[PDB]
Amino acid sequence: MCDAFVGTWKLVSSENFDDYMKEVGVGFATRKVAGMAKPNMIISVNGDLVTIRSESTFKNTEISFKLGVEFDEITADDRKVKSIITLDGGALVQVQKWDGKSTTIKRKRDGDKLVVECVMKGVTSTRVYERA
């Protein structure tokens, strides 16, 4: 399950992430620190349970979830959201909802890369990772 995604992934490019975080409502100071962080993303699977960690000097976070089962999450920027993650077309698609708002984070394998596209109200950021 989700075999392709398993690994340790290091950030290699980031496009439009500051504007994405502005749209989400992340504060100035936090955007500054989060933008200069170069997180590793560590994805593992155990039976039907998927775990994603994001590790950086900014913060360490971890979510554990089942596909297609809504779960509560505190994000790196301290939002309390309801999240649902699904496998569609080989991409892992995460929707976060809070306070009448919504954002989508898509993680797709493209060659030897993991491409992460984050969208909120038509503002899109793209972050590309490769295996560490």
From Swiss-Prot:
One of its GO terms (molecular function) is long-chain fatty acid transmembrane transporter activity. The modification N-acetylcysteine is found at C2. A fatty acid binds at R127, V128, Y129. Gene3D superfamilies: 2.40.128.20. Keywords: Acetylation, Cytoplasm, Lipid-binding, Nucleus, Phosphoprotein, Transport. It is found in: Cytoplasm; Nucleus. The modification Phosphoserine is found at S13. GO terms for cellular component: cytoplasm; nucleoplasm; nucleus. The modification Phosphotyrosine is found at Y20. Changing L87A: Abolishes export from nucleus. A motif (Nuclear localization signal) lies at residues 22-32. Changing L67A: Abolishes export from nucleus. InterPro entries: Calycin, Fatty_acid-bd, ILBP, Lipocln_cytosolic_FA-bd_dom. Monomer. Homodimer. Interacts with PPARG. Belongs to the calycin superfamily. Fatty-acid binding protein (FABP) family. Lipid transport protein in adipocytes. Binds both long chain fatty acids and retinoic acid. Delivers long-chain fatty acids and retinoic acid to their cognate receptors in the nucleus. This is Fatty acid-binding protein, adipocyte. It comes from Mus musculus.
